[PDB]
DNA sequence: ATATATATATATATATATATATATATATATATATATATATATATATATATATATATATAT
């Protein structure tokens, strides 16, 4: 997974294509809002939100 | 491994706003038609006078 690939997918289609890709590809996550993504970051790096 | 209670994401349903078309209520104007009024002419009926057809009364 790289930025170029994501941009290509987006140019091919909107949010729906990326949501489908989430299911298609392993080891990937997406979040439509920042709070959940930051929660994932926290639980990955084992730190408090501060 | 399933129930049972939160949390998040998504979709649905509703409310607001505006644009466009249609329906309803009201008023007015118009036209048409109906009905009536008016005027004129003619028809019918009755009345009166004269003419035609027929008979009788009065005066001498």
């Amino acid at each position: 997974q790289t930025l170029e690939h994501w941009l290509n997918v987006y140019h091919e289609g909107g949010t729906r294509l990326l949501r489908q890709m989430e299911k298609e590809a392993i080891g990937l996550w997406t979040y439509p809002n920042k709070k959940q993504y930051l929660a994932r970051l926290r639980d990955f790096f084992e730190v408090g939100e501060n």
Side-chain angles (χ1 to χ4, degrees):
Chain A
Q1 303 291 314
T2 66
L3 179 61
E4 311 106 321
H5 175 63
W6 294 334
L7 285 170
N8 291 332
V9 171
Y10 170 80
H11 283 343
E12 189 38 69
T15 56
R16 196 210 66 72
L17 189 53
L18 291 158
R19 297 331 293 288
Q20 142 185 330
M21 152 55 88
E22 168 105 321
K23 139 191 52 193
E24 291 189 6
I26 189 59
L28 174 65
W29 293 260
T30 74
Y31 308 90
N33 49 54
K34 202 177 192 184
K35 186 191 258 282
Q36 271 68 11
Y37 152 69
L38 288 167
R40 184 68 170 106
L41 189 72
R42 289 211 326 264
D43 85 349
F44 186 94
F45 283 116
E46 311 191 30
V47 295
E49 187 36 52
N50 158 81

